[PDB]
Amino acid sequence: VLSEGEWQLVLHVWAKVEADVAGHGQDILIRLFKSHPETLENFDRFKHLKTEAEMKASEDLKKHGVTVLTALGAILKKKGHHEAELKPLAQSHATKHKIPIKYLEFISEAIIHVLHSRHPGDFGADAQGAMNKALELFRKDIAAKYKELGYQG
Ligand code: HEM
């Protein structure tokens, strides 16, 4: 369970993301795909993309990054009270998309990497620790829902 102070560190960097969620989403999805190419294969929608340049030029990838980060932001703004937001997400990701917890760990790493690069002013060590805790909580709760839904993750 995060403290209020930790949540405030999370939300203060998220405020920066929200200056340009689209650009942040591009960087995060591209970092995920570059660092863990098997994750790209998981997206039938995107797996044709061959290069970072093609990724950057895809309007469709940009749209999806906005969707992803806005969903995550809505979860983070609940400060742990995210049951309602996690239900549909866990169901789609367990049963339609089939995303293992290890891949949610990979996107978490990509989020931390991009925030660390873009936001040294709001992403020092304590802030990164807080974000890690928030993403750990998200993954813990999603993995519990995966169980309940019949997916090992
Ligand atoms: C922070 C973690 C993530 C969030 C918040 C998130 C959010 C979303 C949202 C909101 C959608 C659209 C609605 C839905 O289907 O549920 C979606 C779709 C999808 N997600 Fe995620 N996602 C996350 C991580 C991942 C990861 C790590 C992968 C794969 C490695 C993945 C694969 C997919 C796929 C395949 C779709 C469908 C894309 C399409 O064909 O339109 N997601 N995600």
Indicate the domain borders of the chain: 1-153
> Are 116 and 57 within 8 A, CB to CB?
no
How far is it, in rounded angstroms, from Cα 63 to Cα 41? 18
Count how many Cα atoms sit within 13 Å of the Cα of residue 105 in the half-sphere of its side chain: 6
Q: CB within 8 A of 99, min separation 6: which ones?
A: 42, 93
How far apart (Å, rounded) are the C-alpha atoms in residues 42 and 100?
Answer: 10
Residues 6+ apart with CB under 8 A from 21: 65, 66, 69, 70, 73
Helix (H, G, I), strand (E, B) or coil at 76: helix
Our answer on whether the CB atom of 63 is closer than 6 Å to any ligand 1 atom is no
Name the amino acid, one letter, at 11: L
Angstrom distance (rounded) from CA 54 to CA 71: 25
Give nearest CA residue, ligand 1 atom 39: 45
- Side-chain half-sphere exposure of 98, counting CA atoms within 13 A: 4
Task: Supply the residue whose CA is at minimum distance from atom 15 of ligand 1.
Answer: 92
Q: How far apart are CA 99 and CA 105, in angstroms?
A: 11
Task: Determine the Cα–Cα distance for residues 20 and 66; give it in Å rounded to an integer.
Answer: 9
- Tell me the two tokens of residue 149: 């839904």
Q: What is the DSSP letter of 45?
A: T
Ligand 1 proximity of 112 Cβ (cutoff 6 Å): no
- Taking each helix axis from N to C end, the angle separating 21-35 and 101-118, rounded to the nearest 10 degrees, works out to 120
The span from the CA of 119 to the CA of 19, in Å, is: 12
Name residue 56's amino acid: K
Work out the end-to-end distance of the chain between its first and last CA atoms, rounded to an integer number of angstroms: 22
Domain 1-153 fold is Globin-like (1.10.490)
For ligand 1, say whether the CB of 104 is within 6 Å of any of its atoms. yes
Place of tokens 């940009």: 62
Which method was it determined by?
A: X-ray
Residue 40's nearest CA partner among 112, 108, 113, 106 is: 106
- Locate the ligand 1 atom nearest the alpha carbon of residue 97 and give its number: 35
